[PDB]
Structures are given as structure tokens and as C-alpha cells.
Design a binder for these strands. Structure first.
Lengths: 45, 115, 102, 123, 50
RNA sequence: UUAAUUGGAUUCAACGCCGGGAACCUCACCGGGGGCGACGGCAGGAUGAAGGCCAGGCUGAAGGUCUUGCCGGACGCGCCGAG
């Protein structure tokens, strides 16, 4: 739940949603890349 | 100078893998034609990154069957003899041979008094 | 003309004879030409194995055998005649395979 | 005892009891997601029909994000005076900080009432 | 990691049906039996001595 | 002799014997690596994985190991009885 900040009534989320398996999957913010550790998918920033 | 089937080590460098294997005996050439193992291919990635300098680890190996090519020449690799990784340094003269040939696993047997 | 070929294979000799006799008795009752049962070669499966479960002692061997017998019955084309053969009571150890040759 | 900062309305005792009873009934004959992580995941997925939130949670950051998110997604949310009671209603020994009803089951009439009785609270 | 590697060939490929030993297995028309195991079931299979 | 050449077998009745074929497997030897230990009790739990996972380092290699952080949406660390 710590990965859900809320400001002015809207929810900001500290990480991206992985598109391969829809919502519910947070995935690593390594700074250099958006790395998905459910299957190893990586979208470099 | 070092010559292999009428070609030098640098001449051997520029030959394609198929032409290179054509210089190898039937055993090694056919082993190459049948394709290296995936573990052999990982070791090839390791040694090739070492030859480009990116891979700085003292390079070990278990693939006793990895046939030495001219591209392994000049590198120190440690082959598992069964208990530890005996080190070998690749001179140009091992082109056409398996790693396990130069990784001794059986100790010397000498003869004492019979029981 | 069309011919129906019946292969009857069984380890038990007497069951094979019984089924063959049943087919024969059906034959002339139905009044159809029925070529007599030809007994083909009997196949002999042989297996030789050492008796000793361990390795010690004299080497002795045991030879176990199966004799599987087989008879061939050729009959002519009459739907009544070849209708009366699925109704035959067939023992378990006897296997019948029926094909149709032109 | 000042109410936590995330509190936006005061729930009557009967309404909190009805919320806990709906939690029990939704456990028995429906579906309830136990824990605030799955609560937020379902509310984000929109599968929650009601959200029960504890009031005696020492770290309020756990439940600081539930009211405004629920008002954002138009999923009614209700409070309960204790997380121990919410764990008891959810049938788990650990204190259930929050519960998200996905299938009210046989709590529908209660939840439909509770939501209505929640819909009068922020007014 | 705990799965045995798939061996189609070699002594490891074939295991006795009854006792599971990796040693002598008779494969004459599909027995898959340990040589010890054969002696106690041959009469059941219909084998006779001659 | 070997880190190891795994053991049994001692004339008749041990020595193409168990091994009825050892590159892996056979395997029981040696070296190295990795995973566990049913089910109960103590404690924990879910606040989230126990299991996998990118980029690497170690690791022969194996998210095995750790840097990094995800899932995974579900109960399994450690000690005792006992497996």
C-alpha cells in the first residue's frame, strides 16, 4: 500500500503498471529502467 | 612462426568458422558441425568478452570437451579436473584439440613394495 | 467372389480347437464353403535367465517358454454365414482377427 | 481521543456493527479481500463494492490513502472502531486493517443499505 | 532443479517395473522387468518349463 | 598408486562372477555446487510469499548467492517431538 500516494483527490503511484499482465503488477524503478520482475520484461527509460 | 595446415595464427584468425573447421580433423570438425553445447556457447561468450577486456574475472570452465580454436590463444583458463580448476595457458599449438587433454585428472602412479 | 479370412491365435491348444470346431460346425449348418483350418507354425518365445539372484556359486540357467498357436480359417461370402461369428462365445485367451480379401 | 486525520465522517455504532456483519456475511457467502494491499488493488481494479477501514490503526499511513481513493473511484467506504473486530468479522486471527467486499453475497441488502447510510455521512 | 534429466538412452533410461532397479532389465517384446523380478512372475505370465 | 580407483566373492562350490556392456545416468567412490527435512507443539503469520524474476558480480553455470527492486496474491523462517 506504500506504493500508492494520493494528492488533490487523485492517486499517484510510485511505480509503473506492467502492460503484459494488466494492472496489479508494480515493477522495479531502477532509475535507468522500468524493469518488470514478474517475467523479466524491461522498458529502459 | 607458427603454422597450422599451411596457415599462420593470424591467417587462422580471419577464417570463417566453417573454413576453420575444415582444417580440423574429422572428430573436431564434425563436433563443431553438430553445434557447440549451450554451456559451451556461454563459455564462448565469457572468453570473447575477456578478449575484448570487458570480462575481467579469472576465467574458469568445466567444458573439458570445448575444442580449442585460434581465438582462445593467449588466454589463461582454469578447467575443472574433477576436484579443482587446473590452470592452462593457451599457446597457438593447441589449435585442433580438446580442453580436457590439458587438464590432468589422474595423478602419477609409482610402484612401492607389494602388500 | 469374396473370401473372409479368420486368424485364431491362442496359447491354449484346446480353446483354439474348440473355437475352430465351433466355426466348422457353423459352416456346414449354414451350407457355405469353408476351407479347413490350416495350422500355421506355432511361435515359440524362449527366455533364458540365470537362476542365481546373486553371483556366487555355479552358473545355472532357466529357460522359460511360451508356445502360441495359430490357425487360419478361410470361408466364403454369405452374410448369414459371417453374421453367426460375432455371436460365438470366445474364450479370453483366444484372439480372433477377421479380414476380408477380394 | 481525536479521530485519525484520514477520517471524513463519524459512523454510528449501529452502522459500524452492520458493516462488520456485512463483512462476516460476505466472507461466508461472498468474497472479501483481506488486507489493505488487496483492498487498494481491487479498488483500483474497481471490483470492490464496499471498503471497511479500521480506526485504531497506529500507523495512519496504512489507511491514509483509502478515503480519498474511494471517493475518487466512487466505491463507498465505511469505518469500524477496531481492527480486531474487522479481523474477527473477516475470520482471520491477525487484525484485519481493512477489508474490501468484492462479492457481498448475502450482505447485498446490508451493503446497499450501508452504502446509502454511508452516502448520508459525507453529506 | 530437483527433476532428473530426461534420459532416453543408457542404463538410467530403463527401470524395472516391479522393483525399479536400474540393472538387468529384459526387454523381449516389452517386459521391463528386473531379472530377479522375472522368476516370480513368469508362471503368472503363462511361462512353463520344458 | 590415487582425493577416489565403491563393495562382495577365496580350492573343489570366488576371479567373461554380482556388473547381464560404467562418457552422464548405472553410482554405492572422490571433489565441488544446489534444494530440502511429512505431520504435530513453541514462536510467526497477511503488515505479504514460501517461489521466481531482469542488469550484473560471484558462480563451470544454476534469482544458487548477493546489489537492486518487482511480483507472486497466499500462510510458512527458526527450535522441539517426529520424520
Amino acid at each position: 500500500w506504500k506504493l500508492y500516494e494520493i494528492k488533490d483527490g487523485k492517486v499517484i503511484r510510485k511505480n509503473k503498471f506492467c502492460p503484459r499482465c494488466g494492472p496489479g503488477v508494480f515493477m522495479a524503478d531502477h532509475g535507468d529502467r522500468w524493469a518488470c520482475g514478474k517475467c523479466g520484461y524491461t522498458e529502459w527509460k | 612462426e607458427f603454422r597450422y595446415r599451411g596457415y599462420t595464427l593470424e591467417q587462422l584468425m580471419n577464417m570463417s568458422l566453417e573454413e576453420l573447421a575444415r582444417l580440423f580433423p574429422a572428430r573436431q570438425r564434425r563436433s563443431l558441425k553438430r553445434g557447440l553445447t549451450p554451456e559451451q556457447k556461454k563459455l564462448l561468450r565469457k572468453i570473447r568478452l575477456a578478449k575484448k577486456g570487458k570480462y575481467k574475472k579469472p576465467i574458469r570452465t568445466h567444458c573439458r570437451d570445448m575444442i580449442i580454436l585460434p581465438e582462445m590463444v593467449g588466454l589463461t583458463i582454469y578447467v575443472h579436473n574433477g576436484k579443482e580448476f587446473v590452470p592452462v595457458e593457451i599457446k597457438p599449438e593447441m589449435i585442433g584439440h580438446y580442453l580436457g587433454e590439458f587438464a590432468p585428472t589422474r595423478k602419477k602412479v609409482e610402484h612401492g613394495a607389494p602388500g | 467372389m469374396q473370401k473372409a479370412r479368420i486368424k485364431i491365435a491362442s496359447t491354449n491348444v484346446r480353446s483354439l480347437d474348440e473355437v475352430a470346431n465351433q466355426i466348422k460346425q457353423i459352416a456346414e449348418r449354414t451350407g457355405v464353403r469353408m476351407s479347413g483350418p490350416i495350422p500355421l507354425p506355432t511361435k515359440r518365445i524362449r527366455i533364458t535367465t540365470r537362476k542365481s539372484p546373486d553371483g556366487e556359486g555355479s552358473a545355472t540357467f532357466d529357460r522359460w517358454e511360451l508356445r502360441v498357436h495359430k490357425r487360419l480359417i478361410d470361408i466364403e461370402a454369405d452374410e448369414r454365414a459371417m453374421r453367426q461369428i460375432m455371436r460365438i462365445r470366445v474364450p479370453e485367451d483366444v484372439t480372433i482377427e477377421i479380414e476380408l480379401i477380394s | 481521543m481525536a479521530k485519525p486525520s484520514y477520517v471524513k465522517f463519524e459512523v454510528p455504532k449501529e452502522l459500524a456493527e452492520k458493516a462488520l456483519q456485512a463483512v462476516e456475511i460476505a466472507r461466508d457467502t461472498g468474497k472479501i479481500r483481506k488486507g489493505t494491499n488487496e483492498t487498494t488493488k481491487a479498488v483500483e481494479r474497481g471490483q470492490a463494492k464496499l471498503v471497511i477501514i479500521a480506526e485504531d490503526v497506529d500507523p495512519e499511513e496504512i489507511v491514509a490513502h483509502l478515503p480519498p481513493l474511494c471517493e475518487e473511484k466512487e466505491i463507498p467506504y465505511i469505518y469500524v472502531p477496531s481492527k480486531k473486530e474487522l479481523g474477527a468479522a473477516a475470520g482471520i486471527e491477525v487484525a484485519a486493517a481493512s477489508v474490501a467486499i468484492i462479492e457481498p453475497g448475502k450482505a447485498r441488502d446490508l451493503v446497499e443499505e450501508i452504502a446509502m447510510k454511508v452516502k448520508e455521512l459525507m453529506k | 532443479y530437483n527433476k532428473r534429466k530426461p534420459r532416453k538412452f543408457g542404463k538410467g533410461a530403463r527401470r524395472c517395473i516391479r522393483c525399479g532397479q536400474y540393472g538387468p532389465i529384459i526387454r523381449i517384446q516389452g517386459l521391463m522387468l528386473c531379472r530377479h523380478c522375472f522368476r516370480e512372475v513368469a508362471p503368472k505370465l503363462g511361462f512353463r518349463k520344458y
